[PDB]
Scaffold this active site. Structure first.
Site, mmCIF file in Angstrom:
data_model
loop_
_atom_site.group_PDB
_atom_site.id
_atom_site.type_symbol
_atom_site.label_atom_id
_atom_site.label_comp_id
_atom_site.label_asym_id
_atom_site.label_seq_id
_atom_site.Cartn_x
_atom_site.Cartn_y
_atom_site.Cartn_z
ATOM 1 C CG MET B 135 -0.197 -0.136 2.511
ATOM 2 S SD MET B 135 -1.411 -0.345 4.001
ATOM 3 C CE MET B 135 -1.500 -2.266 4.085
ATOM 4 C CB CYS B 136 1.335 4.024 1.170
ATOM 5 S SG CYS B 136 1.769 5.752 1.495
ATOM 6 C CB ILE B 137 5.314 5.066 -1.372
ATOM 7 C CG1 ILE B 137 6.323 5.259 -2.496
ATOM 8 C CG2 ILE B 137 6.002 4.624 -0.094
ATOM 9 C CD1 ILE B 137 5.724 5.837 -3.772
ATOM 10 N N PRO B 139 4.096 -0.150 -3.173
ATOM 11 C CG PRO B 139 1.843 -0.189 -3.770
ATOM 12 C CD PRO B 139 2.817 0.490 -2.820
ATOM 13 C CB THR B 190 -5.187 -0.038 -1.280
ATOM 14 O OG1 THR B 190 -5.954 -1.210 -1.574
ATOM 15 C CG2 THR B 190 -6.120 1.137 -1.025
#
Lengths: 221, 219
Positions: B135-137, B139, B190
């Site tokens: 999630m967030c960065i 990925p 996400t």
């Protein structure tokens, strides 16, 4: 949008604010459409504990600086908290509530609460604004107010004794429920005092926030 | 219900390590969903220590594992000790630490390198059909962990999506409250505080992510 004051005392169970309790509190305030306004006393922490070991570290950390991690920087010095601008007040648990917001961890029944916190707390009560304390935080109530209060710290007989011996009517309470002193609009809940997992803790914290919020409006009148 | 979900932390705080909200919200969903969280963090010094009130770096040191332990009340282990065979899934919350301590994406961008152990663990998991959730960065590490194209998100930020596609990934624009899934490789992602404006929003997506990882974890 109603402003709910949230008092943090560091970033972590042993050092300051219980991270789960704090984040869970913020989530409830947010899901309930209210606005959280976080504060922390701008002072050095009593100690810095290695949360993996449990042993103290030979270093210093500032309560406000660290509490800021929980709020992504959206936090202000306790001093700047003005009761007139808040609709309610919530104080998450964690040992920091007993070390940095008071020294209940050391002096127990003979402890002293943080000047500003006590002042703010009183100004709030004196204006009919609801207060919510959780985990060990309720231990400060007897020192913030001289009159008897109905509160909880869970079921731990030993702590309840110390609280009653401080002039308070302790009410045994389960993880998933809260206790309310209807008259003084003060809500409290056992968090990690009894919680075995984060879901349990969320259970009670949600009830606490909902009740503080209910009491907050109904007072906005 | 009772399934072990690996959760990789990178410190304690947005700028320094793991996004505290994202981490706690992840743990709450794992717990509400009846699963068991098993937290890890690389046992190494943090790249930096940031004053979260100011934004400026501090002249001091902090250990990733030591600090991540604050989020888990001590219930955490060194990343090295994480054994894929003992985990049913893997979730990696956001925070700049995912870009500084779990990789150096914050510096080398498209030329970044992921943490050895994290990459190894991540691959072992995928290689065994276990679901992954970033999630967030976080990925941004996927393209460097796997050589084959993946469907993922970092939200809607065109600039970051570019860098990801230029890394060999099919970026899918995604709202705060929704997730993206690479059905084939069982990888869910996400946008958290990449797009989240408040904690409730962030919880919205994180819950969906955890539910889907858990569903996929059923084999």
């Amino acid at each position: 949008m109603k402003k709910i004051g949230v008092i943090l005392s560091g970033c972590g169970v042993y050092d300051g604010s219980e991270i789960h309790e704090a984040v869970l509190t913020l989530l409830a305030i947010s899901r309930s459409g209210a606005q959280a306004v976080c504060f922390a006393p701008d002072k050095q922490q009593v100690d810095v504990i290695n949360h993996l070991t449990g042993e103290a570290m030979t270093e210093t950390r500032n309560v406000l600086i660290e509490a800021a991690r929980i709020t992504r920087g959206e936090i202000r010095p306790l001093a700047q908290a003005d009761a007139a601008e808040l609709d309610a007040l919530i104080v998450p648990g964690g040992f920091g509530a007993a070390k940095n917001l008071s020294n209940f961890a050391s002096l127990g029944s003979e402890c002293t609460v943080d000047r500003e916190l006590k002042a703010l707390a009183q100004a709030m009560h004196q204006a009919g604004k609801p207060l919510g304390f959780m985990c060990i935080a309720p231990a400060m109530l007897p020192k913030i107010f001289d009159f008897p209060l109905r509160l909880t710290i869970g079921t731990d007989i030993d702590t309840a004794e110390v609280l009653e011996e401080m002039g308070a009517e302790h009410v045994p309470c389960p993880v998933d429920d809260i206790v309310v002193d209807e008259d003084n609009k003060i809500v409290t809940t056992p968090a990690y005092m009894l919680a075995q997992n984060i879901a349990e803790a969320a259970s009670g914290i949600d009830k606490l926030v909902s009740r503080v919020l209910v009491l907050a409006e109904l007072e906005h009148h």
